[PDB]
């Protein structure tokens, strides 16, 4: 009773196909390398004196 | 008062019959063998690359 009328039809599909790249028409993943500086300066105190 | 008007009658049985054969002609539990094979793919993956 709960199959009464079921017809099941195959209509389409998708493929799973990788391009081996020998001629690497691809890009990747980029890699770069920048530099950070940061500037360390140092000041003076007030000074100790003995008389 | 309970057990008033109680009757009780037989209607049949069943028994265990074996046949004990000797020419035999039992098919009794055959035993077979046979396999199922996989096969496993190993696919490529998309590049890395500096340029």
Same mark, same amino acid.
């Given at each position: @009773? @709960?199959?009464?009328?079921?017809?099941?039809?195959?209509?389409?599909?998708?493929?799973? @196909?990788?391009?081996?790249?020998?001629?690497?028409?691809? %890009?990747?993943?980029?890699? +770069?390398? +920048? #530099?950070?500086?940061?500037?360390? %300066?140092? &000041?003076?105190? &007030? &000074?100790? #004196?003995?008389?």
């Amino acid at each position: @009773a @709960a199959l009464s009328g079921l017809t099941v039809t195959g209509v389409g599909y998708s493929l799973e @196909a990788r391009l081996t790249n020998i001629n690497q028409l691809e %890009m990747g993943l980029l890699i +770069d390398s +920048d #530099v950070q500086k940061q500037g360390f %300066m140092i &000041p003076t105190l &007030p &000074p100790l #004196v003995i008389v």
